[PDB]
Structures are given as structure tokens and as C-alpha cells.
Amino acid sequence: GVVEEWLSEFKLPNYATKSSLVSSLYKVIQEPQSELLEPVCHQLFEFYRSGEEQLLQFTLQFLPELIWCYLAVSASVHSSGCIEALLLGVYNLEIVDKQGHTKVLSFTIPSLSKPSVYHEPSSLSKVVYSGPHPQREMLTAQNRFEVLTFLLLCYNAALTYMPSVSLQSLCQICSRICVCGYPRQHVRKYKGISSRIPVSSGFMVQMLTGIYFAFYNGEWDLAQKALDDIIYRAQLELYPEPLLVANAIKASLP
Amino acid sequence: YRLRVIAEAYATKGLCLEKLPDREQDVITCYEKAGDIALLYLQEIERVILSELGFFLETGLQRAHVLYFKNGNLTRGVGRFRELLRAVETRTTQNLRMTIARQLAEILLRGMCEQSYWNPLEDPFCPQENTEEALLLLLISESMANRDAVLSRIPEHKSDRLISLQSASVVYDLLTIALGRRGQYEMLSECLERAMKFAFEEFHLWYQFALSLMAAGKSARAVKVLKECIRLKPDDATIPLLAAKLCMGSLHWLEEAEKFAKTVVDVTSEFKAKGYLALGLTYSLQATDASLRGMQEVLQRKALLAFQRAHSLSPTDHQAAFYLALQLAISRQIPEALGYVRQALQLQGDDANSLHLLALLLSAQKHYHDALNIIDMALSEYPENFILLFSKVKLQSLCRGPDEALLTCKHMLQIWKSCYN
């Protein structure tokens, strides 16, 4: 292939700054019949090793597609068994490697009794929302969703630089995942494997953040239907906070 | 007085130049200086008054950012918005700062990520991240907005009340969307509690307040507000479902649970099935809490009948089948129960309660080592459980010998020591 021979001859950000790779790589992961799937997977790992920014920024957008495909098909027929290792390695690199310490993401809420850059009081506590996350060794049925939400948040942190095709694909996954094993699928006429994936509340909130951001970039009908399925599933499963956030989103439209 | 004259002169010059086939940036610059001199004149007059209202100066000030954000000049537009906000507020700019603050909060919340922002003083109290400045903006806006309320009089006029309600709804909507994503619910709940003054017959704020209260930990207040929500609009069935679910939780109120279950059942299939499930669970708990003989069997037969109805009404719910099998096992009927849990496990085989019940049934059938194996991979999938450890200890002591039981006991003691301080 094009990228195949590019790697064959290959074996400072201006190396690719390429307008023909991303589509081919996305079409590669589409079908599960790929002889070079795992080699190109750890080659993507090798790209992620490069601390140079553009490669990681322009290769992080592939995560939702594989997260659906090879974590719903293998984790339902065929078990590749190495992409999970890639995800675990990326998780460890992200959580551990900033300068030699684990992150404690935090911010402080404002106040009204202290002068600010826009107001005066004449006429403060620190809060933590993430971390620490100890490293893992195997994707168990007891901790895999925590790392899934962490990866989703890390991908969320930089939505500015991804293209529209990634947004469309992300909306498609976010819609089809939560309605796959329920009767409403025959309303949508979506085929595949009839099973239910036990998602959590934080996972729903984190996809809702991305859905809200994508709602104002032309994508209207897909995001609308995805919100419909999200609120339907949340109402079915009796999850308070995602339903509250969905209602807030719905009641704030023109 | 001449400054507003030259500002209107620039406005008229731009209005005339729009008909002549980049001069537009020159018109933008004259607009910026017109706005600057207008603000300076306002500051001077508000200084003087201790010792009026034009028409086109605001147009000249605003069309600049209108062109900025309609031509894609997002960076310069937000910079000019920030600089306009930097002006010290007087008695004549409160509504302008209202509008600009609201628009800035919206565009910052739905326009870009965190890694594309820097402090107001610098150029790509001092905020460090975008949601912090958005929160500060929302607090100041609501704080000096709460004093223009209309407080639901409705003697003869309504339109101003509608506009005020719209503004309150949108400001609290932005507050909710800002605070929910970061998992901070206490301050949100207090915010809605303070906001609760305006509403008299409006469903939205009652619903949101009930949801926030129920998602924060407090239960009884949520139950009362949820009851009033039942009173307001008797169409949704999810709200009584939530009330019933909270009723049989840690509160341990049982009569109200059956009341809500009867209400929801007595109203699609996917909802009446859940209502039947809740009714069966309530009946089973009431049976478990009985004190005499006959009533236990009466409630047990009621519960199994309801469970059978719920199972029949929906064929693809593993929870209903699992609970029906559990209720059957409570009645000592083994083969049907084991078949039912087999079907449920076929529906989903990654659970924990299903495997635990299968192991319990195997032990009750006197096949010790197969249940031991089942518990073995159950712990393999969940290496940090507690009840499974007790069951495995009991099985090991019953089958092999005290040595492995002591080993497991010391291992679980070490697990507890590691997990706690």
C-alpha cells in the first residue's frame, strides 16, 4: 500500500506536514481482515513515543474507532490481544510521564468578596477533579471503564485540532454504542452483534461533553439523534446526572 | 460633546463607505477609537456628576465586533470583548456588560478547548483556566442581576416577566452545564435552592432541583420535591420510578415504594415491566421483614407471581430472570431456579451476582469442587471482592482443610490492610 511502502522506505515535524494517510489508515481499521493490523498498531505506538506534538495530535483521533471495533467484537469472535496492551501503555505514559510525577488536576472556584480584574467588592478553596491514577497491568472487568473515561478525557482536552470526519465518526459511535442491545435499534435499523455494553455514568458525561462541542460545528442531525439515544438509555437505566446534563443541553437550543 | 460628534461622523462615514465598490479595517479602527472616546467621556461625566443617551455611538461600538465575529476574526473579536469588559462599570454600561459577558461565556464554553487560551493580561484576580473565568463571569452577572427581578406579580402584564424568566433560565442553564461536567454538585444544589424563589408553577426548575438533590446524597428533600413533581405533571413514569427506587434504598421506607409502584403500573411495555419488577422487590423485602407465619408465604407467592409477569412481558432482561431465579431459590425449588439462572447467564456472562448464585446452587446440590472452581475464576475476574472471599473460605473449610482457610483469611486481612489506612 501507499502507507505500507512509505513505512518500508522509512525504516522536524515537517516529515508529514500528509494529506493522504489519515483516510487510508481509517479504512484499514474498518474491516477486521488485516494482515498488518497489529504491526501498524505498534507502529502507531512508535509514533506516540515521539514526543513531537503534531504526530500525537493528528494520530490521537483514531482512538474511538478502534475502541468500538476491537473492544466490542473481540469483547462481545477473534481476539487480536495486543491493542489493549497499546492502550495500557498509552495510559501509563500519559498518567506517569509529565516530568517524573503523577498529575493532580485541580482548580480553585472564584469568590465575590475579593477584588477581581472586572469587579470590586466595595459596592477561595482548592478543589481536585482528577488524579491520582495508579498504573495498571491488565484490562479487567473491574477497572477497564476507568481507563476508558481517562482516555476519553485526554482526547477531549484537545478537540480543537481534529477534523470533521473524526467528529462524525465519534458521534456515530456515541449513538450506536448505547442502543445496540435494546429494541430501539430496530427503529434505527443498525446491524451487527446484538449485545449490551455496561457503560457507566462518567462515560456518558464525557461523551456528552464532546457531543455538546460538536453540536456547534455543522453536525446537527447526527448529534440530535445521538442525544436522543443517550437520554433514552439514561432514562431506562435510572442515571440521574447524565439525564440532568442532557436536559440542560436540550433546554438551551434556539 | 465634540467627541460624540466625531464618533457619529465616523459612523456616517462608514455608512457612506459601505456603498462604495481594505477600507473596512480603517472603518473598524475609527470604530475602536470612537468607542474609546465614548467610554472616556462616560468616565469623565460620571466623575463630574458628583461635583445623555445617544443612538449611534453604541452602533459604532458594536458593529466592529459584529464584523469581527461574522468574518471569522475570532481572536481579535474575543480580545476586543475582553478589553471592553476591562472598562470600569458605571451606571450606564450594566446592560452592555450583561450582553457581552453572556456572549463571551457562551463562545468560550462552546468554541475551543483548554489548550487555546491565555490570561487576559497576556497575549497568545487572575484566572488560569477558561471555566474559572466563565464561573467568575456567571457569578458577577447573576449577583447584580438578581436585583432586577419581577417576582411573579402578574396583575395585568406578563411580557417583562417572561423576559426575566428567560434570562434566569438561561443563566442557570449555563451555570448547570459549567458545574456538572466537573463533578461538583453541592454548590450547584445550593445555587438552585437560592434560585428557587422565582418559580411558582414551572416544571423545569422543580425537576432540575429534584435531580440535583437526589444526585448529591440528600434523599428526603428529593422525595418531597419529587412528590410535588408528581402533582404538577402526571405524564412521565420515570419520576415515580426514581421515587420508589430511593424509597427502598438506605431510607428503608416500604409503604411509599409500593404506592409509587402501584401508581406507575396503573398508568409502554418497557416501563410497566420495571414497575412490576419494583413491586416484586418491595413485596420480597416486606416478606423478609415479616414476623408471623402465613404472611411470609402470602408475600412470597405475590412476589413470584409479579416476577413471572415481568419476565413474561420482556424476554431480553437478564436482571428480571436473575431475580426470578433468586426468588425461586428462596422457595427451595432447585431445578427450575438453576435453569433460569443458566438462561440469565447466557444473556450475560460477565456479572458477579449470577456466578455467586450459581456457585451457591452448586453447593446446595453437593458438588463442592465445581463450585470451588467457579468461585476461583469469579475471584480471578474480581480480585478485590469481600463476600466472595467469605464464601470461598467457608467452602474451603467445608471441603479440603483449615490450612487453606487460614491462608485465605490472612490474605484477606492483608488486602484490607492495603486498601485502608
XYZ file of N, CA, C and O in Angstrom, chain A residues 107-110 112 114-119 129 140-142 157-161 183 196 206 209 212-213 216 235-236 238 240-241 243-244 247-249 251-252, chain B residues 82 85-86 97 110-113 115 120 125 132 135-136 139 173 176-177 181-182 185 204 207-208 211 214-215 236 238 242 245 270-271 318-319 381-384:
312
model
N -8.261 23.029 40.334
C -8.530 24.445 40.123
C -9.269 24.969 41.346
O -9.774 24.201 42.168
N -9.319 26.294 41.465
C -9.964 26.958 42.588
C -11.172 27.746 42.103
O -11.095 28.460 41.099
N -12.283 27.613 42.819
C -13.506 28.337 42.484
C -13.325 29.811 42.832
O -12.607 30.137 43.788
N -13.935 30.724 42.088
C -13.804 32.154 42.384
C -14.634 32.539 43.606
O -15.241 31.702 44.271
N -16.652 36.402 45.535
C -17.219 37.722 45.303
C -16.792 38.766 46.323
O -17.074 39.952 46.118
N -13.608 39.359 47.102
C -12.236 39.714 46.792
C -12.173 40.424 45.444
O -12.823 39.988 44.488
N -11.422 41.523 45.341
C -11.379 42.268 44.074
C -10.838 41.416 42.935
O -9.911 40.622 43.111
N -11.420 41.598 41.754
C -11.041 40.851 40.564
C -10.718 41.828 39.441
O -10.826 43.048 39.595
N -10.314 41.274 38.295
C -9.930 42.092 37.150
C -11.114 42.794 36.500
O -10.911 43.666 35.648
N -12.346 42.450 36.883
C -13.527 43.065 36.295
C -14.497 43.661 37.304
O -15.455 44.319 36.884
N -14.293 43.461 38.603
C -15.267 43.901 39.591
C -14.555 44.278 40.882
O -13.350 44.067 41.042
N -10.315 17.506 40.769
C -11.275 16.791 39.941
C -10.692 15.574 39.236
O -11.425 14.894 38.508
N -9.100 -5.515 33.292
C -10.076 -6.359 33.958
C -11.475 -5.772 33.806
O -11.655 -4.610 33.433
N -12.475 -6.598 34.103
C -13.867 -6.152 34.080
C -14.219 -5.262 35.259
O -15.388 -4.883 35.412
N -13.233 -4.924 36.092
C -13.448 -4.095 37.267
C -12.818 -2.714 37.160
O -13.161 -1.835 37.956
N -9.375 16.866 25.849
C -8.563 18.042 26.155
C -8.097 18.810 24.918
O -7.707 19.977 25.043
N -8.121 18.200 23.732
C -7.584 18.837 22.527
C -8.507 18.643 21.322
O -8.071 18.249 20.240
N -9.801 18.930 21.484
C -10.740 18.808 20.367
C -10.531 19.841 19.266
O -11.152 19.713 18.205
N -9.691 20.854 19.485
C -9.556 21.928 18.503
C -8.974 21.426 17.185
O -9.400 21.859 16.108
N -8.002 20.518 17.244
C -7.185 20.190 16.082
C -7.687 18.985 15.288
O -7.036 18.598 14.312
N -34.384 -2.564 22.135
C -35.318 -2.614 20.994
C -35.227 -1.416 20.066
O -35.471 -1.558 18.860
N -25.388 -5.833 24.839
C -25.389 -4.612 25.634
C -24.047 -4.463 26.338
O -23.529 -5.426 26.912
N -18.727 12.228 29.835
C -17.596 12.596 28.994
C -17.948 12.553 27.512
O -17.454 13.390 26.747
N -19.957 15.788 26.821
C -19.139 16.983 26.618
C -18.733 17.130 25.152
O -18.894 18.201 24.545
N -21.735 17.985 22.973
C -22.066 19.401 23.078
C -21.120 20.251 22.246
O -21.557 21.182 21.559
N -19.819 19.956 22.297
C -18.888 20.745 21.494
C -19.140 20.554 20.002
O -19.089 21.519 19.230
N -22.041 22.448 17.625
C -21.909 23.779 17.043
C -20.830 23.823 15.965
O -20.148 24.837 15.802
N -32.656 7.420 30.814
C -33.961 7.268 31.445
C -34.257 5.804 31.741
O -34.834 5.478 32.785
N -33.876 4.908 30.829
C -34.100 3.483 31.057
C -33.289 2.969 32.242
O -33.788 2.175 33.046
N -31.933 4.710 34.784
C -32.090 5.480 36.020
C -30.754 6.070 36.481
O -30.294 5.844 37.602
N -29.076 9.607 37.222
C -29.515 10.998 37.417
C -28.690 12.047 36.681
O -29.246 12.836 35.912
N -27.379 12.078 36.920
C -26.559 13.160 36.376
C -26.525 13.224 34.849
O -26.615 14.343 34.312
N -28.851 12.361 32.790
C -30.167 12.866 32.415
C -30.279 14.358 32.696
O -30.841 15.110 31.890
N -29.750 14.806 33.835
C -29.767 16.230 34.151
C -28.977 17.031 33.124
O -29.433 18.083 32.656
N -30.889 17.152 29.838
C -31.997 18.099 29.919
C -31.497 19.534 29.828
O -32.118 20.376 29.166
N -30.378 19.832 30.494
C -29.803 21.171 30.407
C -29.403 21.506 28.976
O -29.620 22.628 28.507
N -28.810 20.543 28.267
C -28.439 20.764 26.871
C -29.682 21.003 26.022
O -29.730 21.924 25.200
N -32.737 22.042 26.841
C -33.488 23.255 27.145
C -32.717 24.534 26.838
O -33.127 25.608 27.291
N -31.623 24.453 26.085
C -30.802 25.611 25.745
C -30.517 25.639 24.249
O -29.381 25.815 23.806
N -12.815 41.312 25.614
C -12.125 41.342 26.898
C -11.745 42.766 27.282
O -11.938 43.186 28.429
N -14.699 44.636 28.411
C -15.015 44.240 29.780
C -14.052 44.859 30.786
O -14.421 45.061 31.948
N -12.821 45.163 30.364
C -11.848 45.764 31.270
C -12.253 47.161 31.727
O -11.728 47.642 32.737
N -22.498 45.294 29.570
C -21.611 44.270 30.105
C -22.354 42.962 30.347
O -21.769 41.892 30.169
N -18.327 26.931 24.246
C -18.616 26.077 23.097
C -17.777 26.427 21.872
O -18.182 26.124 20.744
N -16.611 27.040 22.059
C -15.829 27.473 20.917
C -14.470 26.825 20.743
O -14.014 26.648 19.609
N -13.810 26.462 21.840
C -12.439 25.975 21.757
C -12.125 25.138 22.989
O -12.882 25.111 23.962
N -10.986 24.451 22.928
C -10.527 23.605 24.019
C -9.736 24.426 25.036
O -9.619 25.651 24.939
N -6.431 24.145 25.705
C -5.065 24.430 25.282
C -4.974 25.569 24.269
O -3.944 25.700 23.596
N -5.989 37.166 30.473
C -6.405 38.420 29.818
C -5.283 39.429 29.653
O -5.239 40.136 28.638
N -7.775 39.677 40.626
C -7.796 38.230 40.446
C -7.411 37.854 39.019
O -7.856 38.485 38.060
N -12.779 28.779 34.872
C -12.666 29.651 36.039
C -13.183 31.053 35.732
O -13.992 31.611 36.486
N -16.910 30.936 35.233
C -17.614 30.885 36.506
C -17.650 32.252 37.168
O -18.691 32.666 37.683
N -16.523 32.969 37.161
C -16.497 34.304 37.756
C -17.483 35.229 37.052
O -18.220 35.988 37.702
N -21.012 34.312 38.125
C -21.312 34.775 39.477
C -21.600 36.267 39.497
O -22.599 36.700 40.076
N -28.964 27.746 33.303
C -28.596 26.671 32.388
C -27.092 26.652 32.146
O -26.458 25.589 32.176
N -25.412 25.352 35.297
C -25.523 23.903 35.414
C -24.569 23.197 34.458
O -23.867 22.257 34.847
N -24.528 23.637 33.197
C -23.670 22.960 32.228
C -22.201 23.168 32.573
O -21.362 22.304 32.289
N -20.107 19.072 34.574
C -19.055 18.278 33.946
C -17.898 18.003 34.899
O -17.242 16.960 34.791
N -17.634 18.910 35.834
C -16.509 18.776 36.750
C -16.862 18.025 38.028
O -16.017 17.928 38.924
N -21.393 19.035 42.869
C -22.844 19.060 42.977
C -23.371 19.836 44.174
O -24.518 20.290 44.131
N -39.704 23.047 35.053
C -38.291 22.826 34.755
C -37.421 22.962 35.999
O -36.587 22.092 36.282
N -37.947 20.131 38.504
C -37.311 18.899 38.043
C -35.801 18.949 38.243
O -35.195 17.995 38.750
N -35.174 20.061 37.853
C -33.722 20.160 37.967
C -33.277 20.174 39.425
O -32.265 19.557 39.774
N -33.504 16.623 40.729
C -32.405 15.811 40.215
C -31.096 16.141 40.922
O -30.341 15.237 41.302
N -31.186 14.736 44.496
C -31.053 13.285 44.518
C -29.665 12.828 44.093
O -29.237 11.739 44.491
N -28.952 13.628 43.304
C -27.605 13.287 42.871
C -26.529 13.765 43.838
O -25.343 13.539 43.581
N -45.154 11.601 32.958
C -43.946 10.793 32.998
C -44.053 9.703 34.055
O -44.601 9.917 35.140
N -41.065 7.906 34.776
C -39.721 7.742 35.322
C -39.599 8.375 36.702
O -38.863 7.872 37.557
N -38.034 6.729 40.076
C -36.923 7.223 40.884
C -37.328 7.361 42.344
O -36.550 7.032 43.249
N -37.363 3.930 43.828
C -36.006 3.421 43.986
C -35.331 4.034 45.205
O -34.655 3.335 45.968
N -41.858 -1.466 28.244
C -40.559 -1.374 28.899
C -40.626 -0.640 30.230
O -39.694 -0.754 31.033
N -41.697 0.111 30.485
C -41.866 0.817 31.748
C -42.733 0.056 32.742
O -42.412 0.015 33.936
N -31.916 -9.590 31.604
C -31.249 -10.577 32.446
C -31.491 -10.315 33.927
O -31.483 -11.257 34.727
N -31.706 -9.055 34.312
C -31.966 -8.752 35.716
C -33.266 -9.390 36.186
O -33.330 -9.946 37.290
N -11.731 -12.732 37.979
C -12.272 -11.545 37.326
C -12.384 -10.360 38.280
O -12.219 -9.212 37.853
N -12.657 -10.609 39.560
C -12.808 -9.550 40.559
C -11.848 -9.821 41.708
O -12.208 -10.476 42.695
N -10.609 -9.332 41.614
C -9.606 -9.632 42.643
C -9.713 -8.789 43.903
O -8.810 -8.861 44.744
N -10.768 -7.995 44.071
C -10.908 -7.128 45.237
C -12.319 -7.194 45.806
O -12.900 -6.175 46.194
